[PDB]
Amino acid sequence: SHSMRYFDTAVSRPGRGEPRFISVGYVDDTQFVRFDSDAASPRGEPRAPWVEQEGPEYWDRETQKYKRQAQADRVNLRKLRGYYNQSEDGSHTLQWMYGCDLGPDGRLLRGYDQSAYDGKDYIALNEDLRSWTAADTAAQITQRKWEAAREAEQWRAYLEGTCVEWLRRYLENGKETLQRAEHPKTHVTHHPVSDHEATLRCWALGFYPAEITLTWQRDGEDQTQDTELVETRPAGDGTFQKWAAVVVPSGEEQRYTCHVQHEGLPEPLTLRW
C-alpha cells in the first residue's frame, strides 16, 4: 500500500530566538520535500527528482503553506504552554503527522491527521474522518474549537480527494523509482568469538522499501530469543540495510540458516555460511 506522509516539528527555544519549524514529506520511504525555518531563505525544497519538474508556481505555493504554518505553530506552542500551565522558561515540541494510504481501487484506504505535544499524543482525527480523539484535558479545549469551526470537513475533503490525487500523480512521475522495489543483496559473514564459538551475521543490503524480515533458524527452529537484530538503517543513498547475528558453536555453522523476506524477492531466500 503506497502512502504519502508529512512530518512537522515545531520546537520552542526560550531565549534562543523564534521556535524552529522543520517539515519533511515522504512517498513511502522516499523523502521528496523539506522546509527549515532556520534556513537562509526558508522555502520548500525538492528532495526527489519526480517533484523538481513541478512548476515554480507549485513551489511558491508549498513555500507559502510552510511559512504560514511555521507562524501558526509558533502561536500553537504558546497556546499549549497556557493549556498545560507551563513556564516561559522551558523548551517544548509540537509534532504533526498527516497523509493518506492508497487502496487497490485507486481511492483512499486510510487517512491520518495526528499530533503530539512533548512526545505524547495530543489530538488525532479518527479513521471515520468525522471525529476526534483528544488524549487529555488540554486536547479537549482544541477539540471544542475544532467541533465549532467544523475542522474535520476540510480534512476529510483533503485526505479523500486532494491527498490521493497528489500521491497518484507523484507515483506516476516517479514510477521507475517509487513503484519498483529493490531486492536486498544478501551474504553471511563469520566472526570467531572464542576457540569454541563464532558469530554468524546475515546481511541484507541496498534494499527499497525498508520493510524486511531477517531471521536465523537452527535445524529449522527459530532462534528469535538468541538473535541480535539491528534496526533497519538508511545506507544514505535511498536504500536500506539490516543484519541478524547469532552466536553459534564452532563446527555447527551448517545447522544455521538465514531467512530473508522482502517485496523485491520473488521467493524468500535461505542462506547458509
Binding site: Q69, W155, T162
Partner: peptide, 9 residues
C-alpha cells in the same frame, strides 16, 4: 502537496 489551510490548537 500540503493541506491548504492552517491548524490552530
Amino acid at each position: 502537496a500540503r493541506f491548504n489551510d492552517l491548524r490552530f490548537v
